[PDB]
Design a protein around this ligand. Structure first.
Ligand SMILES: *[C@@H]1O[C@H](CO)[C@@H](O)[C@H](O)[C@H]1NC(C)=O
Ligand SMILES: *[C@@H]1O[C@H](CO)[C@@H](O)[C@H](O)[C@H]1NC(C)=O
Ligand SMILES: *[C@@H]1O[C@H](CO)[C@@H](O)[C@H](O)[C@H]1NC(C)=O
Lengths: 290, 49, 58, 99
């Protein structure tokens, strides 16, 4: 039972259009032009709005202008400089004298339901537990964070077979012993229990975080329009093939978060509302497949 | 400064002298959307692989 | 050494894992991030994240 | 149980764009231009602000100017020359008439 598996990934910027058979040299010699800014540094543009750098204009008025530009930046910097609403995305029902491009697929107004959690249960053998263990990050072990509820996302099972290792010694008649190495087939099984972590109520901002980013190896991540994690994201492989990216830091998350919620499978329940009495999509967010 | 940059800048300045705050702040927002929030003063012409 | 550190130091603090405790305040009575410094990742260790409270003063 | 482990790290500045198969020679012969300051030494610029090096200007005023420039350096040298705050980083809530 032979099985090769080869990968390869060049990622060049920027020289001559790369191609596999290229030498490590003809790359270099062909760098004459095809240069690219590999590193850059500058200043905030408000710094460049000064009466000397500007032509004949009233002194204090350029101070006014610099302050206005800087405040506009500030606005655009912290949040999306919102006077009234997100405007350019779906220009239909928006106040569009400003500029704002938050997001479009919003269907719910639910709260900051952070956390990531699951359960990797073994059915037979010991193979799949070692790699399907997508343990919680917010606690360092299998738990939810305080103020959150580890409500069961989805249970699932798999059946895979690995020819295990077997190097065992066997005595013949207690005088001599032989080592009969004979690797044996075994169908191991693990029951993958995902437990979506959702906040119970109002979160304290000291230990309540927002996140975002989900995709498989086959399904594209429309969050980032790629098949990887955006910058500042650990891809938490909570699911069979999902790598749920984490906005573990505020830094660029504040403007690239998309404050999600949670939802079980269509057969399983749901964490939020539209005392267990409800079982259907938690609020809105019509069937946007993941 | 470039030509277009000075144009946008003195345009916002004419808006502020013309007291029209709303159009002025919107023009500044357009400026920041159109010219970025920083000006570069150093790059390193190179390549990587 | 002081030499270039005085201007390139970023006067950090300390913080255990998210499951372990923390050295500073926000007599063992507290166990949570020591002050502010929201979850600025540095390294993960088998599930728990290890961060700090890195101040960036003068 | 066989296990090779190879490393390699050239770090050149500055000649012809390096590449592994290059000889230790064609590097050299190709150094005609592509020279780089490998070592440098100079003086503090306040030293260069002197009435002789400057064109027609008032004598004691250039002393004033040299002292001012030197003090500005001093400020920027010890700490980040702070009158009121860190300014250019996140220009939102900072006093930004300084640097
Ligand atoms: C691929 O499989 C062949 C046998 O068909 C083997 O000789 C070779 O080492 C494997 N790997 C590569 C990179 O060819
Ligand atoms: C500009 O608007 C302000 C505020 O409404 C007003 O006080 C002022 O008279 C207007 N005109 C000028 C020239 O400032
Ligand atoms: C690499 O492994 C080979 C055997 O495949 C061995 O002959 C050689 O000495 C090792 N080292 C290098 C640098 O090739």
């Amino acid at each position: 039972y032979l099985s090769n598996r080869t990968n390869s990934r060049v990622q060049s910027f920027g020289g001559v259009p790369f191609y596999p058979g290229i030498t490590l040299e003809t790359w270099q010699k062909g760098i004459t032009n095809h240069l690219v800014a590999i590193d850059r540094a500058g200043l905030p543009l408000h710094f460049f709005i000064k009466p000397d750098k500007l032509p004949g204009l009233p002194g204090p008025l350029v101070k006014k202008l610099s302050k206005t530009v800087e405040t506009a930046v500030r606005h655009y910097y912290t949040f999306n400089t919102h006077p009234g609403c997100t405007n350019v995305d779906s220009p239909n029902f928006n106040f569009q004298a400003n500029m704002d491009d938050d997001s479009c697929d919003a269907k719910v107004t639910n709260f900051t339901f952070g956390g990531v959690y699951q359960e990797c249960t073994e059915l037979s053998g010991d193979v799949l537990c070692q790699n399907l263990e997508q343990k919680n990050l917010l606690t360092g072990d299998f738990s939810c964070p305080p103020g959150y509820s580890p409500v069961h996302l989805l249970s699932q099972t798999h059946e895979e077979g690995y020819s295990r290792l077997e190097c065992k010694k066997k005595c013949t008649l207690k005088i001599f012993c032989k080592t009969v190495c004979e690797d044996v087939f075994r169908v191991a099984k693990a029951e993958f229990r995902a437990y979506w972590c959702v906040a119970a109520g109002q979160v304290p901002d000291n230990s309540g975080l927002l996140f975002g980013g989900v995709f498989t190896d086959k399904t594209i991540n429309p969050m980032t329009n790629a098949q990887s994690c955006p910058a500042g994201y650990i891809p938490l492989n909570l699911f069979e093939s999902l790598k749920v990216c984490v906005s573990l830091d505020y830094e660029l998350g504040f403007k690239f978060s998309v404050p999600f919620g949670g939802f079980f499978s269509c057969i399983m329940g749901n964490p939020l509302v539209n005392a267990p009495s409800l079982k259907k999509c938690p609020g809105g967010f019509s069937q946007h497949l993941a | 400064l470039s030509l277009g940059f000075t144009k946008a800048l003195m345009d916002i300045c004419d808006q502020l002298e013309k007291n029209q705050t709303k159009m002025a702040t919107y023009l500044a927002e357009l400026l920041i959307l159109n010219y970025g929030t920083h000006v570069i003063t150093s790059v390193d012409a190179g390549a990587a692989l | 050494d002081y030499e270039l550190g005085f201007k390139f130091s970023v006067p950090f603090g300390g913080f255990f894992s998210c499951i372990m405790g923390n050295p500073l305040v926000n007599a063992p009575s507290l166990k949570k991030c020591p002050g502010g410094f929201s979850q600025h990742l540095a390294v993960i260790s088998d599930g728990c994240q290890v961060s700090y409270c890195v101040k960036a003063g003068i």
